[PDB]
Amino acid sequence: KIVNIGAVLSTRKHEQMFREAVNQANKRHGSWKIQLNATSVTHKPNAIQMALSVCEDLISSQVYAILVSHPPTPNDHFTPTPVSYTAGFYRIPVLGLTTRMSIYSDKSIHLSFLRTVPPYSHQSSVWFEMMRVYNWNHIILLVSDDHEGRAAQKRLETLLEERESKAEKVLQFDPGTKNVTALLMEARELEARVIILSASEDDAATVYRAAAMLNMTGSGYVWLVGEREISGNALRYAPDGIIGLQLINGKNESAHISDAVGVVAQAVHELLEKENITDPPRGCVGNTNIWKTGPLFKRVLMSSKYADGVTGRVEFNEDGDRKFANYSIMNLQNRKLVQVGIYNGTHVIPNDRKIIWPGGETEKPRGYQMSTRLKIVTIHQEPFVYVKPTMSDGTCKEEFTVNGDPVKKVICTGPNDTSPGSPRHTVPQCCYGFCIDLLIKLARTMNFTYEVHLVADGKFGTQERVNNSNKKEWNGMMGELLSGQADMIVAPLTINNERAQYIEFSKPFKYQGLTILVKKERITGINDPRLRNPSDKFIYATVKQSSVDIYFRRQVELSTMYRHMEKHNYESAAEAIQAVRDNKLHAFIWDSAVLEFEASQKCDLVTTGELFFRSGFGIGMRKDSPWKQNVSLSILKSHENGFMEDLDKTWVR
Amino acid sequence: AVTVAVVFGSSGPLQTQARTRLTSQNFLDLPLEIQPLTVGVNNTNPSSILTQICGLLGAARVHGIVFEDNVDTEAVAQLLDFVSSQTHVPILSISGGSAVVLTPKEPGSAFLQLGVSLEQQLQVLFKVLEEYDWSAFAVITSLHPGHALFLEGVRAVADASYLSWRLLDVLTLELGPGGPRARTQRLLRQVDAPVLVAYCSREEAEVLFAEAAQAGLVGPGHVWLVPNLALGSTDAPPAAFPVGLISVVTESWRLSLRQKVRDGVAILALGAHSYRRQYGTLPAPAGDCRSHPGPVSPAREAFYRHLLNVTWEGRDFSFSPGGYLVRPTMVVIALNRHRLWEMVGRWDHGVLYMKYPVWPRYSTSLQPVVDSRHLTVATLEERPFVIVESPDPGTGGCVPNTVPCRRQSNHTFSSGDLTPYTKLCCKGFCIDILKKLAKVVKFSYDLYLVTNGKHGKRVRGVWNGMIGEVYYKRADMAIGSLTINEERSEIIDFSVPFVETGISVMVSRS
Amino acid sequence: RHLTVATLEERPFVIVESPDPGTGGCVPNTVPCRRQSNHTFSSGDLTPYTKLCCKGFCIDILKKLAKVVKFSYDLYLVTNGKHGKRVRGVWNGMIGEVYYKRADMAIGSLTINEERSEIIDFSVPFVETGISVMVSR
Ligand SMILES: *[C@@H]1O[C@H](CO)[C@@H](O[C@@H]2O[C@H](CO)[C@@H](O)[C@H](O)[C@H]2NC(C)=O)[C@H](O)[C@H]1NC(C)=O
Ligand SMILES: *[C@@H]1O[C@H](CO)[C@@H](O[C@@H]2O[C@H](CO)[C@@H](O)[C@H](O)[C@H]2NC(C)=O)[C@H](O)[C@H]1NC(C)=O
Ligand SMILES: *[C@@H]1O[C@H](CO)[C@@H](O[C@@H]2O[C@H](CO)[C@@H](O)[C@H](O)[C@H]2NC(C)=O)[C@H](O)[C@H]1NC(C)=O
Ligand SMILES: *[C@@H]1O[C@H](CO)[C@@H](O[C@@H]2O[C@H](CO)[C@@H](O)[C@H](O)[C@H]2NC(C)=O)[C@H](O)[C@H]1NC(C)=O
Ligand SMILES: *[C@@H]1O[C@H](CO)[C@@H](O[C@@H]2O[C@H](CO)[C@@H](O)[C@H](O)[C@H]2NC(C)=O)[C@H](O)[C@H]1NC(C)=O
Ligand SMILES: *[C@@H]1O[C@H](CO)[C@@H](O[C@@H]2O[C@H](CO)[C@@H](O)[C@H](O)[C@H]2NC(C)=O)[C@H](O)[C@H]1NC(C)=O
Ligand SMILES: *[C@@H]1O[C@H](CO)[C@@H](O[C@@H]2O[C@H](CO)[C@@H](O)[C@H](O)[C@H]2NC(C)=O)[C@H](O)[C@H]1NC(C)=O
Ligand SMILES: *[C@@H]1O[C@H](CO)[C@@H](O)[C@H](O)[C@H]1NC(C)=O
Ligand SMILES: *[C@@H]1O[C@H](CO)[C@@H](O)[C@H](O)[C@H]1NC(C)=O
Ligand SMILES: *[C@@H]1O[C@H](CO)[C@@H](O)[C@H](O)[C@H]1NC(C)=O
Ligand SMILES: *[C@@H]1O[C@H](CO)[C@@H](O)[C@H](O)[C@H]1NC(C)=O
Ligand SMILES: *[C@@H]1O[C@H](CO)[C@@H](O)[C@H](O)[C@H]1NC(C)=O
Ligand SMILES: *[C@@H]1O[C@H](CO)[C@@H](O)[C@H](O)[C@H]1NC(C)=O
Numbered sequence A: 001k002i003v004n005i006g007a008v009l010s011t012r013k014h015e016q017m018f019r020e021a022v023n024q025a026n027k028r029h030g031s032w033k034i035q036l037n038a039t040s041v042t043h044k045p046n047a048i049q050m051a052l053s054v055c056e057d058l059i060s061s062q063v064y065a066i067l068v069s070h071p072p073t074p075n076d077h078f079t080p081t082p083v084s085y086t087a088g089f090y091r092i093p094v095l096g097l098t099t100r101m102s103i104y105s106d107k108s109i110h111l112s113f114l115r116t117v118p119p120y121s122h123q124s125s126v127w128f129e130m131m132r133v134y135n136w137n138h139i140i141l142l143v144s145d146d147h148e149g150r151a152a153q154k155r156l157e158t159l160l161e162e163r164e165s166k167a168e169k170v171l172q173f174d175p176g177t178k179n180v181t182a183l184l185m186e187a188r189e190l191e192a193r194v195i196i197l198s199a200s201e202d203d204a205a206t207v208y209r210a211a212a213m214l215n216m217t218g219s220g221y222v223w224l225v226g227e228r229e230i231s232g233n234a235l236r237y238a239p240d241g242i243i244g245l246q247l248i249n250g251k252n253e254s255a256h257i258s259d260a261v262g263v264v265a266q267a268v269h270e271l272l273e274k275e276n277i278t279d280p281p282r283g284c285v286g287n288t289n290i291w292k293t294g295p296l297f298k299r300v301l302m303s304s305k306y307a308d309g310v311t312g313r314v315e316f317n318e319d320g321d322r323k324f325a326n327y328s329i330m331n332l333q334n335r336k337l338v339q340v341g342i343y344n345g346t347h348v349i350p351n352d353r354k355i356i357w358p359g360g361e362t363e364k365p366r367g368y369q370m371s372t373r374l375k376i377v378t379i380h381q382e383p384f385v386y387v388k389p390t391m392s393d394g395t396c397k398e399e400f401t402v403n404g405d406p407v408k409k410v411i412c413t414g415p416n417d418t419s420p421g422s423p424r425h426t427v428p429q430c431c432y433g434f435c436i437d438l439l440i441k442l443a444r445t446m447n448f449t450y451e452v453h454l455v456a457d458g459k460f461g462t463q464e465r466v467n468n469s470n471k472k473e474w475n476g477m478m479g480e481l482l483s484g485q486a487d488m489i490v491a492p493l494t495i496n497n498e499r500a501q502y503i504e505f506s507k508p509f510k511y512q513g514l515t516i517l518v519k520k521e522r523i524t525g526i527n528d529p530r531l532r533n534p535s536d537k538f539i540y541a542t543v544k545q546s547s548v549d550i551y552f553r554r555q556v557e558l559s560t561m562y563r564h565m566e567k568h569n570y571e572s573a574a575e576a577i578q579a580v581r582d583n584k585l586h587a588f589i590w591d592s593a594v595l596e597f598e599a600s601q602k603c604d605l606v607t608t609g610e611l612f613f614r615s616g617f618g619i620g621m622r623k624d625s626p627w628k629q630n631v632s633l634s635i636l637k638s639h640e641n642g643f644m645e646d647l648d649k650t651w652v653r
Numbered sequence B: 001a002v003t004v005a006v007v008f009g010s011s012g013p014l015q016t017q018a019r020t021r022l023t024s025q026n027f028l029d030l031p032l033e034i035q036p037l038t039v040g041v042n043n044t045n046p047s048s049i050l051t052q053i054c055g056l057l058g059a060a061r062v063h064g065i066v067f068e069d070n071v072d073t074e075a076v077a078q079l080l081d082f083v084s085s086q087t088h089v090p091i092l093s094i095s096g097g098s099a100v101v102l103t104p105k106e107p108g109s110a111f112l113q114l115g116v117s118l119e120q121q122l123q124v125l126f127k128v129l130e131e132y133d134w135s136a137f138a139v140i141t142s143l144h145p146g147h148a149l150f151l152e153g154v155r156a157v158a159d160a161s162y163l164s165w166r167l168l169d170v171l172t173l174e175l176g177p178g179g180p181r182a183r184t185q186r187l188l189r190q191v192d193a194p195v196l197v198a199y200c201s202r203e204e205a206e207v208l209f210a211e212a213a214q215a216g217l218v219g220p221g222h223v224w225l226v227p228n229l230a231l232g233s234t235d236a237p238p239a240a241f242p243v244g245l246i247s248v249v250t251e252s253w254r255l256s257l258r259q260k261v262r263d264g265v266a267i268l269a270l271g272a273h274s275y276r277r278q279y280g281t282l283p284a285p286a287g288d289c290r291s292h293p294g295p296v297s298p299a300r301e302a303f304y305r306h307l308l309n310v311t312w313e314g315r316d317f318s319f320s321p322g323g324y325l326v327r328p329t330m331v332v333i334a335l336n337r338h339r340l341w342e343m344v345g346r347w348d349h350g351v352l353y354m355k356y357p358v359w360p361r362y363s364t365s366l367q368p369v370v371d372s373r374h375l376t377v378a379t380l381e382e383r384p385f386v387i388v389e390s391p392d393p394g395t396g397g398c399v400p401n402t403v404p405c406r407r408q409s410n411h412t413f414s415s416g417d418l419t420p421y422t423k424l425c426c427k428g429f430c431i432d433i434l435k436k437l438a439k440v441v442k443f444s445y446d447l448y449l450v451t452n453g454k455h456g457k458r459v460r461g462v463w464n465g466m467i468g469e470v471y472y473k474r475a476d477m478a479i480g481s482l483t484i485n486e487e488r489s490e491i492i493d494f495s496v497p498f499v500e501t502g503i504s505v506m507v508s509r510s
Numbered sequence C: 001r002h003l004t005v006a007t008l009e010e011r012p013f014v015i016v017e018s019p020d021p022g023t024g025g026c027v028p029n030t031v032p033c034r035r036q037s038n039h040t041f042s043s044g045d046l047t048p049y050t051k052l053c054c055k056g057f058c059i060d061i062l063k064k065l066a067k068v069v070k071f072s073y074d075l076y077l078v079t080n081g082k083h084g085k086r087v088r089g090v091w092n093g094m095i096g097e098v099y100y101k102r103a104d105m106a107i108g109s110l111t112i113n114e115e116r117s118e119i120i121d122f123s124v125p126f127v128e129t130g131i132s133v134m135v136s137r
Helices: A014-027 A047-058 A080-089 A123-133 A147-162 A181-189 A201-213 A233-237 A253-274 A293-302 A434-446 A476-483 A547-553 A559-565 A573-581 A592-602 A628-640 A643-651 B016-026 B046-059 B076-087 B118-132 B147-159 B185-189 B202-214 B257-279 B298-308 B429-441 B465-471 C057-069 C093-099 C114-119
Strands: A004-009 A037-042 A063-068 A094-096 A113-115 A139-144 A169-173 A194-198 A222-224 A243-247 A327-333 A336-343 A374-378 A385-389 A410-416 A427-433 A450-454 A503-505 A510-512 A514-519 A587-591 A605-608 A615-617 A620-622 B002-008 B034-040 B064-069 B091-095 B136-141 B166-172 B195-199 B223-226 B246-250 B330-335 B341-346 B374-379 B387-389 B403-407 B422-427 B444-449 C002-007 C015-017 C031-034 C051-055 C072-077
Touching: A004 A014, A004 A047, A004 A253, A014 A037, A014 A253, A037 A047, A047 A063, A047 A080, A047 B046, A047 B076, A063 A080, A063 A253, A063 A293, A080 A094, A080 B046, A080 B076, A113 A293, A123 A147, A123 A194, A123 A243, A139 A147, A139 A181, A147 A169, A147 A194, A169 A181, A181 A201, A201 A233, A222 A243, A253 A293, A374 A434, A374 A476, A385 A410, A385 A434, A410 A434, A427 A434, A427 A450, A434 A450, A434 A628, A434 A643, A476 A503, A476 A620, A510 A592, A514 A573, A514 A592, A547 A559, A547 A587, A573 A587, A573 A592, A573 A605, A587 A592, A592 A605, A628 A643, A628 C114, B002 B016, B002 B046, B002 B257, B016 B034, B016 B257, B034 B046, B034 B257, B046 B076, B064 B257, B076 B091, B091 B257, B118 B147, B118 B223, B118 B246, B118 B330, B136 B147, B147 B166, B147 B195, B185 B202, B257 B298, B374 B465, B403 B429, B422 B429, B422 B444, B429 B444, C002 C057, C002 C093, C031 C057, C051 C057, C051 C072, C057 C072, C093 C114
Parallel strands: A004 A037, A004 A063, A063 A094, A094 A113, A139 A169, A139 A194, A194 A222, A374 A450, A410 A450, B002 B034, B002 B064, B064 B091, B136 B166, B136 B195, B195 B223, B223 B246, B374 B444, B403 B444, C002 C072, C031 C072
Antiparallel strands: A243 A327, A327 A336, A385 A427, A410 A427, A503 A620, A510 A615, A514 A587, A514 A605, B246 B330, B330 B341, B387 B422, B403 B422, C015 C051, C031 C051
16 A cells, blocks of 8 residues: 655745655654655646646545645745645645635645645734733724735734724725725824724835825824735835734745655655545546545544654644744844744744834833824703703803802803704803812813713613614614714713623712602512502603613513513603603603602602612723723722712702 | 526436436526526535535636535535635535525625525514414424524523513523433433424434423424524434424425526526626626636626526525525424324415314323323313404414413314314413413313313213313313302312302382 | 632621531531641641531622533632731732732622722722711711
8 A cells, every 4th residue: 555645836946855854754653664755746837737736646645645836936826726626526635834714724625735834914913912911902903904904804804803892993995996095084083092903015015105195003003914014015105103913934835845745755654544545536537425434534634743853843723734833033123034933833022132112212002092082972951960051151150159159160062953753053152060079079180171062862871773774783872882983981871791891880879779669659670469469550751762771671570671661761761750750651760860850859759669670870881991991990989989979969959 | 598507416316317418408488598507516515515516617607607506404504605615616516505694694695595595584483383373382402513502592582572572591501422311311300391392313302302202392292493503304203303494495305406406596596697698698607716816806796686586486585685485375284193294384474374273182102191292272262261352453373371272173064074163262261270280280281162062061961161162072171160069070070179159130110 | 610709798798707516517508618827737747727617698699600601610718817908018818819829819898999990900890888977866
């Protein structure tokens, strides 16, 4: 039994190296009777003629495995495709030595394909590690629209989703298209200062020139790119201080040939014990069935720890890709590509030199540039946020407390519009109260300026399925905070699990619960049989798109509760209270903090039962906002000294 | 005029080739008469395929190529895609084998498969599950290449649906010829799910069904659903396939080879005619292997787009950018009692046409009898215990915690043998008890209301009501407001009482 | 996935008991806990740690968290100071154990305040509290 392997090369000289390497491999092994044989063929220009060349010689001979290399001149995924298809027809394993494209990782297209070199997509992994090293969280994924960009983005998103994080935004750059300036203009607005690029040489050069035009290469920014973006045309126009990376061996054909023949021989020896070896198809013509042993040969070849190779230990993952690697990190320091570290496979190891960031700084920059002018959204809640009309001169009535203290007021832009339906005019008013006083204290403590505006639709916000679609989208202050119109929510927003997945909540600044308001006392909580057996006799309702809606919708035990509620929800809390007092609605379920104040001030109404959902009000921010801790600390401090007691006494008597 | 070529590989009779060009004097219905060309490979291997396509290209200037294969051929699709990418010739795959959708195409590809993707199949299967209200299912996938796309599709369809789709368990098996017998029986032994969606190839499907039969997972109480990957040559299915297997195919599944060839020729002819009527000139024929084009010519990119949106004989054949068929008329088929694949429902335009109001189950695979875990539960309506209501109009079906109950037949006008039922949604105390019982004892049930009598009364020697239904083997059990007394215990067996009642008298205190 | 949880006895929330001698172990719905092993109670080779059983509100919350987040955990009490106070710039108690990485997390009657929230991280409060005055009627 003579086990023959084959190779398709280009240089006509590396085939002699492959013959030498296979001869050495034959000189060392368990058995020496298999008489390992080798054959080789040079590359052909025509792809169809190339595939026919694979069918002849290689396939015609009794070959067990095929190796394929790539000519030095970059031609991308064009040369190994025909041999991969032809050998995958018979499930004959094909080992790639220099190709880097991720299209060959898809086992649906290329069935029997393994590679000894990681693809371009795997680079994203090291980026994650770097993001762990420097604690960067806000990133932008500027990736091409081709398969490579989609694969890199998908892998990075998978890694990020394994952890608790998410990329700020991705930007699809269509290959070969000029004017990428729109994407850079969009990315300049965002808070993230870490730019990640995945594109070819021409695309990388184009985006580098466009970013130089937009001055996005200055101080504070961080650029992380791949191998294709620090070579060829890209390196010429690349801005200084970018951090790229490159594989250690990369193009050392001889190392990848020796390391491949060693593992192939080890695999052959390993599976030869079980025998049941089926001879190869012996020619494309005269056979239409796959080689039966082929699948098992590939399966045993994938799990083969050949830890004596030129390029280190060889191991393959579930998709037939070389598990580990070593990436050298490159910095463009004064037009020179200097090495500053080596990625062992799980952690980057910095040994010598110092990273020079693009702005010229010698100190690690944080990955965000939080602005000073802060847009803050708020809603109209009577005990917390009083909204009053401003006089014709642009400021509203001056007022003082009963004790004799000046009431601080700010200017806000609310939905006041004479036109019916939606708000069609944002006429300014003046806002004050508990939340605005807290906001003023917070802004004084944290040294930032603010612009306060009211929510567009008068709702707190729950995610709901968008019309003519199947996905759910947020609305209200929730939607405006997530979209970007507002940067912080200072309002009585109830903390709950649904909102905490997308919004970051500070420490609660007001503990409260949910209670029931009726006319001025035969209701005990939400467990009374009348409230468990809905009917026209006792009607109960809440505010649409609020925390109570979410609470009842997320309860399996209270489905009928929400079913009855859905028929009578109200636009706002104030109109619901007015309807209840006027004997148009029987019971109104709402927060204790507001309901108790309404019952105390306006009287003629009573709160019944004990609080059945204890929660707190919190300042809402975008996910992973850098200044969450600040605010939380301040809130805790306000609880400690005297501030929340004074705010309670002054506003909610 | 237009040259359209037909390629073969299904082998079979050799005379059909002549007919393939005899139909040359049949396309008079189609405008812009077409000259066909018939050369068929009989070894379906890469060398012969490439050489014959080379010679066909070199001999006569062809405008489009139609390919057909029999079944279960994997790598032919990649070869056709490679040839289309190289020679820049619009190919069209008909019949099966090479019609399985190959999702990521090459940038210059013009494969244009006449198949339907995995996402659409999963959409239709989930629609069927919604129609039969099977909220809790389990997904069984092999290590066949492509199971990742299947898992992504099922997750996407589950997320993109109004219903609260429950995914009980996802378990990956290891099938194959012989292989590792163990580690599959143990895993299949502890999957507690009434409906299973499987994804595997034909041989893997056969092995999985055999193992499930050995694992007590087939028969009534277990509904299997598979995409076309498990089905092979639907003319004759293997014996290992269990009765009640459900799949979704395209409309052309019942067509013959000649009809499919005619449809492909019509597609190419209509594309060429649209191109001619738009540009005022006949489409440019393709070349050959030498002098590869490189950048796709603007004419090619226009002929391809014209070929994309084509409608013929009512059915629409619009092609997605990926190369498969978007919004086709799909048919949901199933394996019947006589082990023959027959149509059960259609899809048409976003609306399901199921011919079974209630999914039937058969005595097949009932070797230990105990496998008949399925039950039929007769029930009545009493305001405190069991209450029915109309289905919720917003999302169809029912509200959570509400079992679907079908009223007995359609007595209002169909008071006869006619089986069709009428759906309602049942809830209450007794329904909660029945749900808990089915959860604990691990059985499935078909809840249905009673029309003859109310609770049971011996009239002229026969029993009506729920007692009548149970006593006459029409229902395995009856739950509701059924009082235990001596006359009923003598003919049927009750259970331990779960709520104490009696005879009581009500008056007016006013 | 194995978290090391530090805690301290607080009658309403954390209760420590000796295990039942009759059955060897202790009553279910009671998580086994160990006492700090600084002082060796081995007395040769028997056991270097005092094995008690902990129960109460906080332990119930911890069990629910272990079920939901799907993690495993041990549990040991703190014998170096109370809940925690900075003395000479160092921290003792539960805050000391967590800050110096001796334990993954601390559960019990631990109040959120600024001085602790600066040095360590805190989760969302699960029971509200504060300063209160007790007088005899
Ligand atoms: C061992 O490999 C050598 C590789 O050269 C094979 O020699 C080739 O054999 C094929 C088929 O007979 C011929 O078409 C080539 O011309 C041969 N090449 C040379 C350089 O002689 C040899 O046949 C193999 N031994 C086997 C298969 O037993
Ligand atoms: C890409 O196209 C946009 C057009 O939307 C160009 O934007 C204009 O650029 C000029 C000069 O830079 C400005 O005076 C205009 O105000 C811009 N218009 C807008 C709407 O922004 C942009 O310059 C183009 N870029 C390239 C590289 O061609
Ligand atoms: C690929 O790598 C190998 C080893 O990593 C290189 O082999 C070295 O070659 C030089 C001269 O060519 C010798 O002086 C060294 O002793 C060799 N290394 C060893 C370990 O023996 C080989 O040159 C590399 N090929 C390329 C193209 O860079
Ligand atoms: C990356 O480089 C390191 C060298 O620092 C390689 O580590 C070698 O690993 C082999 C086998 O595991 C050992 O025999 C060597 O002693 C190691 N080198 C040193 C200096 O300790 C590592 O294998 C490389 N990574 C890969 C994937 O090859
Ligand atoms: C609060 O922020 C303002 C603006 O960022 C700070 O004012 C700057 O102060 C520095 C020196 O402290 C000056 O060099 C800048 O020119 C000032 N800018 C402006 C616009 O006034 C202010 O110092 C901050 N308050 C602090 C740090 O307590
Ligand atoms: C939270 O507040 C602290 C103050 O205790 C901030 O720490 C200071 O931050 C400024 C600028 O970020 C630095 O110039 C000071 O040196 C920091 N002080 C110390 C003692 O380190 C902290 O930055 C705030 N958090 C955020 C996100 O801004
Ligand atoms: C099928 O698609 C083609 C191209 O998308 C349509 O061709 C267009 O026809 C209109 C008028 O008939 C022209 O104004 C467009 O310029 C054409 N698009 C091109 C040339 O790309 C064709 O009309 C579609 N079929 C039908 C029935 O509408
Ligand atoms: C090897 O093949 C024989 C039949 O030729 C079969 O009985 C045996 O199980 C096989 N062993 C394997 C596949 O390990
Ligand atoms: C609110 O809108 C009305 C109608 O446009 C307008 O008359 C009124 O002046 C507005 N309020 C204020 C404070 O300007
Ligand atoms: C909203 O969806 C409905 C379908 O429920 C559709 O009829 C209507 O046109 C859609 N409206 C808009 C503005 O898309
Ligand atoms: C296949 O080749 C030709 C088809 O043109 C046929 O005549 C021949 O008999 C076939 N050879 C076989 C089936 O071995
Ligand atoms: C009721 O059953 C009859 C029996 O065939 C059927 O014709 C009718 O359509 C059914 N009505 C429904 C399902 O509403
Ligand atoms: C350990 O125990 C000793 C008593 O033996 C006492 O000093 C203290 O509790 C601990 N000492 C430390 C932690 O240094």
